[PDB]
């Protein structure tokens, strides 16, 4: 199950990026998914926020759990500590 992963449209349109393909499971939590994305691009996961259908998902849950299916895609985003 493959699932894409892209910033947000106004953050493309002004300094450009690839959208990322992850090789994923149904089964596989959001934790899992943020450390594949730092396996792949080096972000930390504790600054990734993911978003899906407009609402953002939270770490524990599974990708079955949001219905996200073969091929949805997901919007990465910032998020700053301090």
């Known amino acids: 199950m493959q699932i894409f992963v892209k910033t947000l449209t106004q953050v493309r349109e002004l300094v450009g990026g690839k959208t990322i393909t992850l090789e994923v499971e149904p089964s596989d939590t959001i934790e899992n998914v943020k450390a594949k994305i730092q396996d792949k691009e080096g972000i930390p996961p ?3 926020r993911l978003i899906f259908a407009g609402k953002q998902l939270e770490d524990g849950r599974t990708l079955s ?3 996200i299916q073969k091929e ?3 919007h ?3 998020r700053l500590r301090g």
């Open 76 to 78: 990465l985003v910032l």
């Open 46 to 48: 504790d600054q990734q």
């Open 72 to 74: 949805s895609t997901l």
């Open 65 to 67: 759990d949001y219905n």
